[PDB]
Structures are given as C-alpha cells and as structure tokens.
Design a protein around this nucleic acid. Sequence first.
DNA 1: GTATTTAATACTATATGTCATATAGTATTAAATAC
DNA 2: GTATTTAATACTATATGTCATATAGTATTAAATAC
Lengths: 102, 102
Amino acid sequence: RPKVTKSDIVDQIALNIKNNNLKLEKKYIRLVIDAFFEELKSNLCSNNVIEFRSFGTFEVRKRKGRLNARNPQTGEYVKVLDHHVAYFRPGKDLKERVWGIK
Amino acid sequence: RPKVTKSDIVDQIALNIKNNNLKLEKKYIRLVIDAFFEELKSNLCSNNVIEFRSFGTFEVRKRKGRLNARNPQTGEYVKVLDHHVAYFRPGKDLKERVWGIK
DNA sequence: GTATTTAATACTATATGTCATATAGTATTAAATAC
DNA sequence: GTATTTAATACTATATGTCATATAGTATTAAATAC
C-alpha cells in the first residue's frame, strides 16, 4: 500500500534502463517524464485521444451536470454544470495483470 | 476524436525538449517512455499508488462482482467475480484544463 | 546531494443516479521488427 | 526513415446497480528551486 512519487519512478526507470546495459542520466529521465506529462495534458485539452498499446488510453469524456449534487459537509443541494473529464481506460496487459490481485 | 500514438507523443516530447534549448535523441525518449510504462505497470501490480502531483494518480481499486451481469449481445445473465482495476484519478491542473472544453 | 518554500492532496461528512460494465467476432491500426 | 507482420482496439448490442461525486479547511507532502 505504498505511495510512489515521480521521483521514485524516475529512479526505477534509471534502474530498469541500466538492467539492459544502457546508461541514461537521471537528469534526462526526469526531463522526458516532465515533457511527457506536459505533452499529454495539452493533448488532452485539444480533446485528442492518446493510445499506448498494452497499457491504456487517455481521452476526454463528457459528464452530465446535476442539481441533486450535495455538499458532503452540510447536505446543501449544489449545482454542477455539464463538463468534461480526463479518463484513463486500461489496456489488456494492464487490465489482466491487475485483475487477480491480493 | 483524433488519435495520438506513443510515437507521436515521443515526437512531441522531442520538440518540447528542444524548444527549451536541450537535445535528446528520440532514441532515449522512446526508451524512457517504455521503461516508464513498464515501471508503472509493475508498480500497479504491487498495488502501490503512483502520484504525479497535479496531473493525476494511479492506483488499484476493488470492484464488486455480479450475477446481474449481462452479455450485451444476447442478454444472457453472466457472472463476474470481485476483482481489481487500474484507476487514473485526475490532478488539479489536468482536471481544470479539461473541465470547460468545446 | 540538502534546505527552503509553495501549493497540491488526503481527509471527511452521505444522498444521488450518471456512466462503465458485461460479450465476441471483424476490421483497424499501433508499433515492434529488420531493413 | 519505410515495409511487413502481429496482435491490441474500436465497434456493437442494453439492463444493472456499484461507486465516484458534490464541499472546504487542516495537516501533509510532492517537488521545483537554488544552493
């Protein structure tokens, strides 16, 4: 049940990369990862669909607003407008490797 | 509706990276990205929580099975066991840049 | 690498009903590969 | 870079009810920064 950070991942990618007799400076790894997220965000804003086979797909989905909305704290009915949301849709490999988990 | 691929993203990261007077071979970019996904998957399998401050969080969630399940095609009642699923939970920046979208 | 500073998340209450789910076979198309 | 080959996705039917949602203020903590 641990909490992994962009930093840990960057370190792991460092390992993973060297395990295959390759050498890349954590510097460049951190760099790619940042550009990666930046690029993914803008891509999402443009309402594009990014697909990474064997992992998952990112896309924007529409979501109907409500009036029934509730303020968890007070119960006061709140209004929510029809908006859009970032959605990750799991790929075969990922979906199957996670299905039966302890 | 457009469709972006791991390849296009890799190219965009190439651009993004050079726009900031830096030079990294598409080779190494493709590399990081692959190790990135690899590492994220195993991290998910270990039922860890990966957090990328203001972008989103990945985590495994439990999902109750059913009997009511249906075969979209035939209507035949199907059974589904309690399992786990990969879930992406949008971060502030992402959730806000996507909210009001045409 | 470490110390400092800023701001994103976890946390929480608990009604409500939208939206992802289930299937499998065909046509695409991502993308790994060797060139 | 391009052509070839393999296998992951899009696509689709449409009942069902789980599960994410709304809020905001406090304590954490990711992580960008300059050293």
